Amino acid sequence: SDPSSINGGIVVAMTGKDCVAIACDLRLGSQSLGVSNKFEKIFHYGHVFLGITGLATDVTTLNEMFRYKTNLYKLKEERAIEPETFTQLVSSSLYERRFGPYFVGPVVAGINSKSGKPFIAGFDLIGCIDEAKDFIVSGTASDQLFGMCESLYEPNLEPEDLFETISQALLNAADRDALSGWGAVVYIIKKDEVVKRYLKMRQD
Amino acid sequence: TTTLAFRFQGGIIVAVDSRATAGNWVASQTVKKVIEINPFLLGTMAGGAADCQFWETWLGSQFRLHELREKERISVAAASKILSNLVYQYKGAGLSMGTMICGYTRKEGPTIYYVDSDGTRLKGDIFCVGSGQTFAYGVLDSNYKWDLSVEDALYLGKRSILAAAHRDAYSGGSVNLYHVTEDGWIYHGNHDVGELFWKVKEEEGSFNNVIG
Amino acid sequence: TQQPIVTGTSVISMKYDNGVIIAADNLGSYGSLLRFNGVERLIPVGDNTVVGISGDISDMQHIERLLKDLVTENAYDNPLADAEEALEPSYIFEYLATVMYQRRSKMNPLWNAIIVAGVQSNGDQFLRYVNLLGVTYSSPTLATGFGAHMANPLLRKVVDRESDIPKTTVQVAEEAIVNAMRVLYYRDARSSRNFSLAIIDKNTGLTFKKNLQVENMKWDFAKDIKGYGTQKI
Amino acid sequence: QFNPYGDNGGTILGIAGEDFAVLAGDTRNITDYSINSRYEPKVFDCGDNIVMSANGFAADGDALVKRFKNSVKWYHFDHNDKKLSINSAARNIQHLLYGKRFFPYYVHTIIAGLDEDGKGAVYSFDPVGSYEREQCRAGGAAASLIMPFLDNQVNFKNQYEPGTNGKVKKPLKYLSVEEVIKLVRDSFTSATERHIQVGDGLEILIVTKDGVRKEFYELKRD
Amino acid sequence: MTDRYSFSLTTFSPSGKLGQIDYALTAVKQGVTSLGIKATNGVVIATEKKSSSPLAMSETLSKVSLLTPDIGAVYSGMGPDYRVLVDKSRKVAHTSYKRIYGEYPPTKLLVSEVAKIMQEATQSG
Amino acid sequence: MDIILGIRVQDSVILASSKAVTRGISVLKDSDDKTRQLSPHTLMSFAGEAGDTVQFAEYIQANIQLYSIREDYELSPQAVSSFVRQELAKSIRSRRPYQVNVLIGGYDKKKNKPELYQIDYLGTKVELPYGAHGYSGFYTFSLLDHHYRPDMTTEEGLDLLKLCVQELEKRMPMDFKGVIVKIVDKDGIRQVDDF
Amino acid sequence: MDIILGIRVQDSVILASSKAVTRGISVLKDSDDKTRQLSPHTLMSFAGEAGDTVQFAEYIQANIQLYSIREDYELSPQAVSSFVRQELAKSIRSRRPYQVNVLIGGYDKKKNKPELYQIDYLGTKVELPYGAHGYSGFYTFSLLDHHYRPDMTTEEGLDLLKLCVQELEKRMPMDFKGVIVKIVDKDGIRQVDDF
Amino acid sequence: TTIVGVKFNNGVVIAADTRSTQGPIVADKNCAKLHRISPKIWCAGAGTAADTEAVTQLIGSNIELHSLYTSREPRVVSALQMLKQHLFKYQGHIGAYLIVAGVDPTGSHLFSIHAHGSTDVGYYLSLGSGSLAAMAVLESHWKQDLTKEEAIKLASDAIQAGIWNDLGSGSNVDVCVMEIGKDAEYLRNYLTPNVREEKQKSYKFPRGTTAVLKESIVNICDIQEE
Amino acid sequence: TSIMAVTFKDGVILGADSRTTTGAYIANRVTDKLTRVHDKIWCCRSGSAADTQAIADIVQYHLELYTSQYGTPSTETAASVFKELCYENKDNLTAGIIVAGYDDKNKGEVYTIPLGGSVHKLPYAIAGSGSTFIYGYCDKNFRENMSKEETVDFIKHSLSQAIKWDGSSGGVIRMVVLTAAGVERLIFYPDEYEQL
Amino acid sequence: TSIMAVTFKDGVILGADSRTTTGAYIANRVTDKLTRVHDKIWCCRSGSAADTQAIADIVQYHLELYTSQYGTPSTETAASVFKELCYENKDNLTAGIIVAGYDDKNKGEVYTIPLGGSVHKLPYAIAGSGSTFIYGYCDKNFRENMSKEETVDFIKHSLSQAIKWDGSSGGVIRMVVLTAAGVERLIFYPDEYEQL
Ligand SMILES: [Mg+2]
Ligand SMILES: [Mg+2]
Ligand SMILES: [Mg+2]
Ligand SMILES: [Mg+2]
Ligand SMILES: [Mg+2]
Ligand SMILES: [Mg+2]
Numbered sequence A: 001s002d003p004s005s006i007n008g009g010i011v012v013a014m015t016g017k018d019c020v021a022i023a024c025d026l027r028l029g030s031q032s033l034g035v036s037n038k039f040e041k042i043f044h045y046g047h048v049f050l051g052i053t054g055l056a057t058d059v060t061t062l063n064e065m066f067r068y069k070t071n072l073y074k075l076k077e078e079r080a081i082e083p084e085t086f087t088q089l090v091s092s093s094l095y096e097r098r099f100g101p102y103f104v105g106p107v108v109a110g111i112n113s114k115s116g117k118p119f120i121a122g123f124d125l126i127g128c129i130d131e132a133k134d135f136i137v138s139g140t141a142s143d144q145l146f147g148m149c150e151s152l153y154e155p156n157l158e159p160e161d162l163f164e165t166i167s168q169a170l171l172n173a174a175d176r177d178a179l180s181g182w183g184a185v186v187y188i189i190k191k192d193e194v195v196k197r198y199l200k201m202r203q204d
Numbered sequence B: 001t002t003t004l005a006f007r008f009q010g011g012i013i014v015a016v017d018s019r020a021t022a023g024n025w026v027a028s029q030t031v032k033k034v035i036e037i038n039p040f041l042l043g044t045m046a047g048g049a050a051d052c053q054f055w056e057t058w059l060g061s062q063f064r065l066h067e068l069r070e071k072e073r074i075s076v077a078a079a080s081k082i083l084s085n086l087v088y089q090y091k092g093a094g095l096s097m098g099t100m101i102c103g104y105t106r107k108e109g110p111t112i113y114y115v116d117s118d119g120t121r122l123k124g125d126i127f128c129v130g131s132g133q134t135f136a137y138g139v140l141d142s143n144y145k146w147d148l149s150v151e152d153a154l155y156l157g158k159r160s161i162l163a164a165a166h167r168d169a170y171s172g173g174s175v176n177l178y179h180v181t182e183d184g185w186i187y188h189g190n191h192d193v194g195e196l197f198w199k200v201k202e203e204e205g206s207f208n209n210v211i212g
Numbered sequence C: 001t002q003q004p005i006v007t008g009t010s011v012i013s014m015k016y017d018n019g020v021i022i023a024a025d026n027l028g029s030y031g032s033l034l035r036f037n038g039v040e041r042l043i044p045v046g047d048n049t050v051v052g053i054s055g056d057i058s059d060m061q062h063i064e065r066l067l068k069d070l071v072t073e074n075a076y077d078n079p080l081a082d083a084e085e086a087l088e089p090s091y092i093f094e095y096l097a098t099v100m101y102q103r104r105s106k107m108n109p110l111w112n113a114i115i116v117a118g119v120q121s122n123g124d125q126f127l128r129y130v131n132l133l134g135v136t137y138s139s140p141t142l143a144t145g146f147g148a149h150m151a152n153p154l155l156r157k158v159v160d161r162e163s164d165i166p167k168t169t170v171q172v173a174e175e176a177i178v179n180a181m182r183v184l185y186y187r188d189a190r191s192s193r194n195f196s197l198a199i200i201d202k203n204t205g206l207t208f209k210k211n212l213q214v215e216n217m218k219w220d221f222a223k224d225i226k227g228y229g230t231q232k233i
Numbered sequence D: 001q002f003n004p005y006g007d008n009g010g011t012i013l014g015i016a017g018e019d020f021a022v023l024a025g026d027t028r029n030i031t032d033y034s035i036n037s038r039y040e041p042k043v044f045d046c047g048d049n050i051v052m053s054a055n056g057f058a059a060d061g062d063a064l065v066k067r068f069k070n071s072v073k074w075y076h077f078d079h080n081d082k083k084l085s086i087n088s089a090a091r092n093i094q095h096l097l098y099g100k101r102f103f104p105y106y107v108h109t110i111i112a113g114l115d116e117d118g119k120g121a122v123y124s125f126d127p128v129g130s131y132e133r134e135q136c137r138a139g140g141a142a143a144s145l146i147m148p149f150l151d152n153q154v155n156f157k158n159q160y161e162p163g164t165n166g167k168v169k170k171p172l173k174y175l176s177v178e179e180v181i182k183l184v185r186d187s188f189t190s191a192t193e194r195h196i197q198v199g200d201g202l203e204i205l206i207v208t209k210d211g212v213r214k215e216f217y218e219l220k221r222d
Numbered sequence E: 001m002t003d004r005y006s007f008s009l010t011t012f013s014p015s016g017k018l019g020q021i022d023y024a025l026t027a028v029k030q031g032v033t034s035l036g037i038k039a040t041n042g043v044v045i046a047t048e049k050k051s052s053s054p055l056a057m058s059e060t061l062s063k064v065s066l067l068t069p070d071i072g073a074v075y076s077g078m079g080p081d082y083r084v085l086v087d088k089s090r091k092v093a094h095t096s097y098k099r100i101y102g103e104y105p106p107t108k109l110l111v112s113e114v115a116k117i118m119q120e121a122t123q124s125g
Numbered sequence F, G: 001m002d003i004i005l006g007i008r009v010q011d012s013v014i015l016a017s018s019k020a021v022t023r024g025i026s027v028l029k030d031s032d033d034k035t036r037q038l039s040p041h042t043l044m045s046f047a048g049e050a051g052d053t054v055q056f057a058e059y060i061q062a063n064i065q066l067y068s069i070r071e072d073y074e075l076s077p078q079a080v081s082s083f084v085r086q087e088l089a090k091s092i093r094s095r096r097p098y099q100v101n102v103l104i105g106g107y108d109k110k111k112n113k114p115e116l117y118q119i120d121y122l123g124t125k126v127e128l129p130y131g132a133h134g135y136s137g138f139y140t141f142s143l144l145d146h147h148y149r150p151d152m153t154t155e156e157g158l159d160l161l162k163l164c165v166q167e168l169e170k171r172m173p174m175d176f177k178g179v180i181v182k183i184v185d186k187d188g189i190r191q192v193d194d195f
Numbered sequence H: 001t002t003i004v005g006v007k008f009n010n011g012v013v014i015a016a017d018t019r020s021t022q023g024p025i026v027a028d029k030n031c032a033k034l035h036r037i038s039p040k041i042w043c044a045g046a047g048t049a050a051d052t053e054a055v056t057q058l059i060g061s062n063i064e065l066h067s068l069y070t071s072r073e074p075r076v077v078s079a080l081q082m083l084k085q086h087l088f089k090y091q092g093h094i095g096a097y098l099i100v101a102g103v104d105p106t107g108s109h110l111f112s113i114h115a116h117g118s119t120d121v122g123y124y125l126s127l128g129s130g131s132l133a134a135m136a137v138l139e140s141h142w143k144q145d146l147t148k149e150e151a152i153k154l155a156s157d158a159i160q161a162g163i164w165n166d167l168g169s170g171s172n173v174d175v176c177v178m179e180i181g182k183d184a185e186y187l188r189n190y191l192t193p194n195v196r197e198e199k200q201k202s203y204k205f206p207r208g209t210t211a212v213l214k215e216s217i218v219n220i221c222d223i224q225e226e
Numbered sequence I, J: 001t002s003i004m005a006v007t008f009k010d011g012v013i014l015g016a017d018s019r020t021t022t023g024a025y026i027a028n029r030v031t032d033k034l035t036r037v038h039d040k041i042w043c044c045r046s047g048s049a050a051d052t053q054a055i056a057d058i059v060q061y062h063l064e065l066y067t068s069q070y071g072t073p074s075t076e077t078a079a080s081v082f083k084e085l086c087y088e089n090k091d092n093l094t095a096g097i098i099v100a101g102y103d104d105k106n107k108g109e110v111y112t113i114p115l116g117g118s119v120h121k122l123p124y125a126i127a128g129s130g131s132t133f134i135y136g137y138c139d140k141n142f143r144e145n146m147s148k149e150e151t152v153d154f155i156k157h158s159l160s161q162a163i164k165w166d167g168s169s170g171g172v173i174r175m176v177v178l179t180a181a182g183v184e185r186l187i188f189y190p191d192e193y194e195q196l
Helices: A056-077 A083-095 A142-152 A159-174 B049-070 B076-089 B133-143 B150-167 B193-204 C057-075 C089-105 C146-156 C170-187 C220-224 D058-078 D086-098 D143-153 D177-194 E019-030 E079-101 E107-120 F052-071 F077-091 F136-147 F154-171 G052-071 G077-091 G136-147 G154-171 H049-070 H076-089 H131-141 H148-165 I049-070 I075-088 I129-141 I148-165 J049-070 J075-088 J129-141 J148-165
Strands: A010-016 A019-025 A028-030 A033-036 A042-045 A048-054 A104-111 A118-123 A135-139 A184-190 A193-199 B003-008 B011-016 B020-022 B025-028 B034-036 B042-044 B098-105 B109-116 B121-124 B126-129 B174-181 B184-192 C006-008 C011-016 C019-025 C028-030 C033-036 C042-045 C049-056 C112-119 C125-131 C136-138 C141-143 C194-201 C205-213 D011-016 D021-026 D029-031 D034-037 D051-056 D107-114 D120-125 D131-134 D136-140 D201-208 D211-218 E034-038 E043-047 E065-068 E071-073 F004-008 F012-018 F021-023 F026-029 F035-039 F042-048 F100-108 F113-119 F125-128 F130-132 F179-185 F188-192 G004-008 G012-018 G021-023 G026-029 G035-039 G042-048 G100-108 G113-119 G125-128 G130-132 G179-185 G188-192 H003-008 H011-017 H020-022 H025-028 H034-038 H041-047 H096-104 H107-113 H119-121 H124-127 H173-179 H185-191 H212-218 I003-008 I011-016 I020-022 I025-028 I034-038 I041-047 I095-102 I108-113 I120-122 I124-127 I173-179 I182-188 J003-008 J011-016 J020-022 J025-028 J034-038 J041-047 J095-102 J108-113 J120-122 J124-127 J173-179 J182-188
Touching (some): A010 A118, A019 A118, A033 F125, A042 A056, A048 A083, A056 A083, A083 A118, A083 E079, A104 A184, A159 D143, B011 B150, B049 D086, B076 B098, B121 B126, B133 F136, B133 F154, B133 G026, B150 B193, B150 F136, B174 B193, C006 C057, C011 C125, C019 C125, C019 C170, C042 C057, C042 C194, C042 C205, C057 C089, C057 C112, C136 D034, C146 C170, C170 I025, D011 D120, D011 D177, D051 D136, D107 D136, D136 D143, D143 D177, D177 D201, D177 D211, F004 F136, F012 F100, F012 F154, F052 F100, F077 F100, G004 G042, G012 G154, G042 G077, G042 G179, G100 G179, H003 H107, H011 H041, H076 H107, H096 H173, H124 H131, H148 H173, I011 I108, I034 I173, I041 I075, I049 I095, I124 I129, I129 I148, J049 J095, J075 J095, J095 J173
Antiparallel strands (some): A028 A033, A042 A048, B003 B011, B020 B025, B042 B098, B109 B121, B174 B184, C006 C049, C011 C019, C011 C141, C019 C194, C112 C125, D029 D034, D120 D131, D201 D211, F004 F012, F035 F042, F113 F125, G012 G179, G021 G026, I003 I011, I003 I124, I108 I120, J003 J011, J173 J182
């Protein structure tokens, strides 16, 4: 019934020293029924990464919409969109559906190509921006993720340390949520290299 | 929840998952869904956890009083009917119960009774109860034979819970196995689904859809 | 299950170094109608306890009779009724708390929020809350209804924790209570200017003050306020 | 319509050690967005080396604890001052809870102590009496924030030994009382940061063969 | 009533000339001189305040206009046409950019939007 | 309608769909083909609310047939599935949404690969080795999880499909009157007339 | 439960009752005998709410068995049916009524006549040549109205019963997993093990 | 949320806490609730966070265009009128509850706006879940002819009352001071009375603790030459 | 809310309390419910604050545009514009407005516009939640052609009682006097009117 | 309904209208709402006619049995019996009763018992649907230790206004005077009180 918890799933994003990390589980379900273990919730437009939890049809629709918009942006601006600008675009796009919203929990992550500054941001389904320094959480195990992140996180982690922190934050949060899990992906993002790691986890 | 029990040549296999949820929140992964009524009788837990625990524990007290008075082991038929008659008195009050009363006696042999909070009492050879019951049934129905060995029967029960644990979001954690004989039940261990899944995937070649 | 008809609003209270203070206005409201202006909602029990009651007035009067009956009953076959075996604030509270929880458990509550303020035999301050649900809690400051939202913040600036109680005098505590009552009169639509205040001190005993009024009110600034935005005249 | 139930917030945490047990709980009591008390004890010494807390609706919580303490007293009268073992206490509490099956105590009960072999024991109850011996159990408002952290840091879930890469699990080494208290404090500090109903103070009751000891710690008051 | 001129008033002549555009450029030619120079660390735009009368307060007539905090405009030709273009240019900087991206448009894109408005007046009915 | 199954094997996609059409109390038909050929190498099965199912399926069919004529070219199964998903995603926020779940079984002639796409009425698309809609998956997925291999032949896929249908016929309360099975491969679409 | 049929022929009563027991989503059993022998020449089939059906049937059985022992005498089918009706008529105004419909097939040894009684959960009794409960009559009564004769043999009754079951299996949406058929005559009660 | 506005001698000050919540969960511990409508017109929002931010940007945008059109600095009454008429049109469905404050050529102003479009004038105002705690402080200590320093003290004390006593409010105090004939000074995190204490333990994991299935480089760069 | 308008010899006086509540919380204790739609045409507002403000603002706009074209509008004209808005939008409004004005030709006039959007010209009008408690008092004590001082006392005593009994009313008693002489604002504080 | 009881120098006077309605239909226009529970203890009834009659009849029984055993009951005692019935059966009653009586020791006393079943001893009390409209009037015009003639005028004028504004009230104004001299019934007709 509740659109934001029909399909399930989670996204978490963290900042580190000269790097950001964004991670998601791979589950798509119809309530109790597990349907897909390959439903990736993180996308990227140039160097800007977008995670989206919530109703899966809207996750797909918004990805296609932001691909659409960032492609036109690039053609006109003659440059790739930045995380700060994209965050405003996500907010604008969600709020234009104020009284008929996409049932999603988007999470932006990336590094500004000019300043080199790590950036993350979260949104509610309606466009309100949460621009946290430390971490952003989203999905059906957001409480669990808040608990994990709040204790596990420390500032200025190196890329390979940040990987361990965000992975453990995701995994253990997902294992306390019926509608999350079935695999996981972690993106470690640096100014000019991005590493994508699929995690091994319990498949129940 | 996923609980099953089936009759076979060597007695009864009882297999259950271990997950308990409150909505989407996984409250516990270490729940005991097999109630050890007494050394000879087992009951499964589905629906209301308290209702199953309380009344199947109470159950063991009634059986103990029976065999003290009658100087004889209570039958699985009489056993299951004490429970079904009890819950039937409460019908409408809102008890939530779906259980298999499992036992092996001289006069009856291996017997399983599905007992219900609606007052249903069904004798049968294979029963599966819970949110993941349909997944377990599939594995059971396609692989079940009366002439299964105790080893293969135990694995079939384990594998059928694994099938449900994987697909059903409200099932998982670990698998508890029991083997019921005439001289009593025998516990066959707690098996973490996480470790069991990968083990079964490799050794069996199943779950090719899943990347390991 | 009922609905409250004639109601009393906030009861506020706090601990200080030698005892407790409790206050409540003299209004018995009938919905938005300010029906009864001479209602005493602080009811003393003996010389060591004051029970402050908000919510349904008919249930308050019932509770008032229970406490009156309790004193009578305690005196029966009790040579030390006015000494070692006199009623303590803790005895009176636990009794009410039992009744409140029993009544909510029968789905027929006494529609009240109660604060029992007093001083024990050993001189210890007693201040504890109980309501229609049988919920109980203690704190250096306690307040019911609107008092909880507006009085507590002000009273907590004086006694923010247990260690502030010995540092707080009766003059400072009373001043804070009286100011809180003014704030409630400004902002609670079901309050009156007239109130009663009770002090239970371990040295000077029970001081019960009737017919107090909210004074030193600020209203002069209202003359300058015009319209709701653009209006100048 | 009259609603006999309420939510007094609060969060409790029981952890069973090797030869000890801790039952912790925040001291904040609330209704809706208001604080009733910054220090309202929630975990209680019930005698016979048993500690108890019934978190949720405080009136039912207080009623249950009161009735259990009473049951301990009458167990002594009826059975020649015999010590009530933690397992026996647990079964007794089930019957207290299930006694009100159709008008439940709206609480999540946890007790802690030592079993008859002297090992650490924690038991966890649902509102209607289904119970279970557990090693680790958070209850109440911020339970969802605390349990995943405990799965990771107590049971070493999802943690593997470096170099093996997922092949060898981190071994389940026993935690000392000092180590457990660190995890309890950090659990509540984290819960306080991210949950509005958690804060003010943390009171921990530690149970050993020597008896019941108390430790108090400040929490953020916002 | 109704705007019954739903057809183009600017059309290609046999020689391939768009007359109304050429004539508009002729009007620009008659207009007062304005210029722009780009430096390494800035840009300058300038023009003469041709006062129509000495009684007129030429400070109230702004030939140089702020479009965004980082963009300015000057013109040559018909002043009233410029004034309404500045109004539209300011609004379009918000409606088609700032309200979407939370930042002011880059010079080239705002210019592109102004150009689009001027193109439409060259083809619309 | 009720049960629709799909399985992608080595070199083909197999769709199995129930034949029953029940309107309340009576089974009005026991030979209903719940599928439409969208293009020579793309088949779509469907299940959902009465009327909407066929209306939607034929609407999609017409659109793909139009595209095929205009461009003189067959769209890839992926392209068709994306088009279908968008129509359903558009539909879910309409005045009256299409209550239709579909499986799209196609053979990509460019990549020489079979492809099975599962899309529900919300526009939830997933590419799968095997899929279902409604309660069908609850009975069949445990069998498919166990037996499925990506290198299965068409004949092995049909045998695994029979086992799935047998389990459905045993444990489902509803009589769905068997299934029509169709195979989509490089040569096109054909019906298995004996099942 | 679902379908229970009854037909009174020349010298016997035949009761046909479905074997399926469905609890929501799954068919838990396909061999359930929805009947109890009340006395040597009186059989009662039953269908209704879960638990109530068997509880009621066994309660009636116990009472008739008690009467049989006390008086050393078998009550007539009419007497048993009246007793059963009263219990259901008593039940309908109770705190929680028995939601049970029954057919009572008996052979009256005094009159040497087969007798079929249809009683619903309200206590609505009717003596019939053939009867049913729930939706069973909707499919079968048109066939029974056409073919039934009061002088039919047991074998002809079974053939007409097969035709009724075939029509049910064709047009009913639910799979009731066939029927157990029992015959009540002068020699007592016996089950037709092949049907 | 706790937000307040306090008039003083030569201007007006607004303040706010920095806690934003989704239910009982704290989403952001350092949220910025003080929003800019124009350089010297600021407002604080409570209720639906997206609506407060969205409605202030829209009016702020139209205020800027209006300012450019009229060659005049924007007025608070214009922001007020544009906000209320917008909110009234949507009949409370835009859940924006605002305290609008600012200085302009007319003088210093302080208004509140409710979601249905009703506005109020005052010398001291409070909005949000901690408005009662804050108003208690304002009613106890407010006086006429407050200085700049007194108004900042009063405003922040009122926010603190909300921070400590209201569960919906917490963390830090943001302040913005708008004085006549001066630039408005935005004081982000004016008070910081809720820094988290050092944890008992470091939870930095040993490298290689997490089990990994696959690694790969993601191509964020464009299609390359040659 | 307690509001009233009373005609007298020299013109008309509008009176009002200053309490605005959200449930039992007094959201504003110094509200100005006497609002100006024209120089000498004012109104008392009761009901939804959003609605009555929106209405008053629209009326003020209409009378401002009326004045630019046709000169000063009559009080009747102002009441008609109020009525038109209240009547035509009765399904979406909760507004109880009293319109009071001073012409030189017509002198002091009072029009009341209740929830339905009807218009009633009266010698005096009372409205708002607190008005219920003073129907008896006002009917017994009102006289036509009172003096300014008598009318101020009548309004002060009336609203004093309305405030005393109505929890939704309170604060200060604001008044606006409309005569040929001009527009005079009056305010009366609790310490003054409570002892009456 | 409009009812009131007023203490004065010589004792107490109960006053009431005579209208009883079923919706907008006046079922009885000459109702007697002043009812006798003892020689010099009477009551005014408002709310459910069935309930208040049932209560009054039970009280009269209780005071009759009280008198047989313990002699004449106090007005306080009568009010207590009323309260006991109203409070304990609050879930099933809709009764608003004013109790008035005359002792020689205590003189005139008035107790009001509203819906909840609380008791309030007052110098005078007003109740019923029509009372809302005269809170202002009665508060301004009541004085303690009035004469019989003044109290009759006060009640007559008060209920006249209550009747004027309340559609649920009307008919005749009945009054019962309780003093040492005895019990006097008074009636006042529309032509008398409407012109006041
Ligand atoms: Mg999971
Ligand atoms: Mg699972
Ligand atoms: Mg906190
Ligand atoms: Mg799907
Ligand atoms: Mg409205
Ligand atoms: Mg008042």
